[PDB]
Amino acid sequence: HMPVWTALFDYEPSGQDELALRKGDRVEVLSRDAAISGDEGWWAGQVGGQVGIFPSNYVSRG
């Protein structure tokens, strides 16, 4: 059911609230709302067994 989003790039977290990404990970995107991520241009999601925020430009739909 949940839409497919793919990490375009590696992302190394700067905090425990940030999601680590590796290029080509399928990322479960949980919100695009800045009021939920707390940081304009950041989304919330789950990958790697962690939930957290990442910069929105790091994933693409499909």
The number of C-alpha atoms within 13 Å of 28 and in the hemisphere containing its C-beta is 10
Q: State this model's resolution in angstroms.
A: 1.5
How many CB atoms within 10 Å of residue 1? Answer: 2
| Strand-strand pairing, 28-31 and 42-47 | antiparallel
Domain 1-62 CATH (choose: 3.60.21.10, 3.20.20.210, 1.10.3720.10, 2.30.30.40): 2.30.30.40
Residue 16 CB partners (closer than 8 Å, separation 6+) = 52
Q: Which helix (H) or strand (E) holds 37?
A: helix 34-37
Alpha-carbon span 46 to 33, nearest angstrom:
15
Which whole-number Å values give the CA distances from 29 to 7, 17, 22, 33, in the listed order?
A: 11, 15, 15, 11
Where are the domains positioned within the chain? 1-62
The residue type found at 31 is: S
**Phi, psi (deg, nearest 5) at residue 58:** -90, -5
Residue 17 CB partners (closer than 8 Å, separation 6+) = 52, 53
